[PDB]
Design a protein around this ligand. Structure first.
Ligand code: CLA
Ligand code: CLA
Ligand code: CLA
Ligand code: CLA
Ligand SMILES: CCCCCCCCCCCCCCCC(=O)OC[C@H](COP(=O)(O)OC[C@@H](O)CO)OC(=O)CCCCCCCCCCCCCCC
Ligand SMILES: CC1=C(/C=C/C(C)=C/C=C/C(C)=C/C=C/C=C(C)/C=C/C=C(C)/C=C/C2=C(C)CCCC2(C)C)C(C)(C)CCC1
Lengths: 51, 122
């Protein structure tokens, strides 16, 4: 069967599922951005932009 | 005019003090040989300002505006007391009684809630 390091080559001639993979990666990146900000908001002290 | 409870109820006007026409700029003469009294005193806060905690380095605290969260429950009213005429001529109001306190909670930026006893007791 395919080796572990080539699993994603099954997309090379499958434009739809290639789009589906790209969408999922875009979903994950935007979710990160959203989760990272929310964590930063929950931990940020805004009371002193000087020091 | 002469409004009734049923006119006011639920409108928010019960928390408002009465007002005077723009044309009431007369004067009330004070007869030193007379004794006077406040029959109704109404206070209606419109803004609540809280001093911020100037960090250790400080420089100067400010009075920061705040958001009211406890609704139209803020006014002092039906307050009574005698208006004395002092002999230097001044007037002194001495509160006797009335609805002279309201608990109020305002909110600062960041979400800190600041309760206070808004009051003129004594
Ligand atoms: C952007 C991410 C992404 C995307 C879109 C794909 C997409 C795909 N993979 Mg690939 N894959 C990925 C990441 C990704 N994979 C990773 C990271 C691995 C390493 C584990 C693999 C391993 C892998 C294999 C072994 C196979 C695929 C296969 C496939 C296809 C079908 C889906 C499947 O069975 O995979 C399912 C893949 C997963 C369920 C991996 C999910 C990983 C989880 C969600 C990580 C979460 C960890 C943990 C919960 C983190 C939380 C915090 C922690 C502190 C608790 C499709 C093209 C299959 C295929 O058709 O190829 C022949 C296949 O057999 N993938
Ligand atoms: C846009 C970036 C991009 C894309 C779309 C691909 C896509 C592909 N690569 Mg390439 N590659 C890239 C970047 C990229 N590569 C870079 C930067 C490197 C240098 C490290 C490589 C080195 C490389 C090698 C050496 C090989 C590929 C191979 C492949 C194919 C199979 C990969 C697979 O199934 O993974 C399967 C992977 C897993 C099941 C698990 C991997 C788990 C990794 C090690 C840790 C996970 C990190 C974590 C998820 C965080 C993500 C990283 C961060 C950057 C976001 C596929 C066509 C293979 C190929 O050509 O086959 C024909 C192959 O042999 N790639
Ligand atoms: C005029 C037509 C047109 C337009 C506007 C685009 C636009 C885009 N294509 Mg390209 N594409 C076209 C024709 C077009 N393409 C043709 C004719 C082909 C050959 C079939 C391709 C093949 C192709 C591939 C294979 C891939 C793209 C991808 C992308 C997107 C990458 C950026 C992204 O995901 O942003 C991030 C997304 C957002 C910020 C949100 C986007 C919301 C938009 C406005 C779409 C709303 C829904 C809409 C009705 C669906 C149709 C989308 C449209 C691309 C047809 C981008 C939206 C990549 C992709 O889909 O990545 C996920 C990708 O993998 N396209
Ligand atoms: C420009 C930015 C950018 C680019 C080019 C990529 C490119 C890629 N990402 Mg994405 N990613 C990005 C930003 C980006 N990412 C961001 C901002 C986030 C949110 C934090 C993610 C989250 C994300 C996830 C969750 C996943 C990807 C995956 C992938 C790979 C999918 C194709 C594949 O099979 O790779 C083939 C894989 C490789 C060539 C491996 C490359 C190894 C890279 C260079 C990192 C080096 C190893 C890593 C650091 C060791 C991990 C240690 C750690 C676990 C302790 C590709 C390498 C998917 C993936 O890796 O699937 C296996 C996947 O699961 N990315
Ligand atoms: C959300 C994030 C989730 C991330 C998922 C986690 C990462 C996923 C898996 C990564 C683990 C990779 C292990 C593959 C390992 C393994 O499969 O190797 C053997 C494998 C052989 O491949 P073949 O071409 O023979 O294919 C046979 C197939 O069955 C493989 O699928 O070679 C490779 O994978 C190439 C890279 C070799 C790498 C060899 C490293 C040698 C280590 C030994 C030395 C150790 C240190 C000792 C010296 C002090
Ligand atoms: C479904 C849906 C929804 C929801 C959504 C959500 C809920 C999402 C989420 C999402 C998210 C929440 C996302 C997340 C993401 C994350 C990630 C993606 C991350 C990753 C990371 C990584 C990749 C890392 C790596 C590393 C490590 C770990 C260590 C260090 C080094 C490095 C950095 C490499 C809505 C309602 C809208 C609509 C309807 C549908």
């Amino acid at each position: 069967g395919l080796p572990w390091y080539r699993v994603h080559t099954v997309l090379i001639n499958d434009p739809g599922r290639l789009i589906a993979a790209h969408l999922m990666h875009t979903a994950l990146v935007a979710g990160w951005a959203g989760s990272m900000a929310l964590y930063e908001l929950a931990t940020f002290d805004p009371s002193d932009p000087v020091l | 005019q002469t409004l009734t409870y049923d006119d006011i109820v639920g409108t928010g006007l019960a928390n408002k003090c009465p007002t005077l026409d723009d044309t009431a700029r007369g004067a009330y003469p004070i007869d030193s040989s007379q004794t006077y009294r406040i029959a109704r005193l109404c206070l209606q806060p419109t803004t609540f300002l809280v001093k911020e905690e100037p960090k250790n380095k400080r420089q100067e605290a400010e009075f920061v505006p705040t958001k009211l969260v406890t609704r139209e429950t803020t006014s002092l009213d039906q307050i009574q007391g005698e208006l004395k005429v002092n002999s230097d001529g001044s007037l002194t109001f001495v509160e006797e009684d009335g609805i002279d306190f309201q608990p109020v909670t305002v909110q600062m930026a960041g979400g800190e809630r600041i309760p206070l006893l808004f009051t003129v007791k004594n």
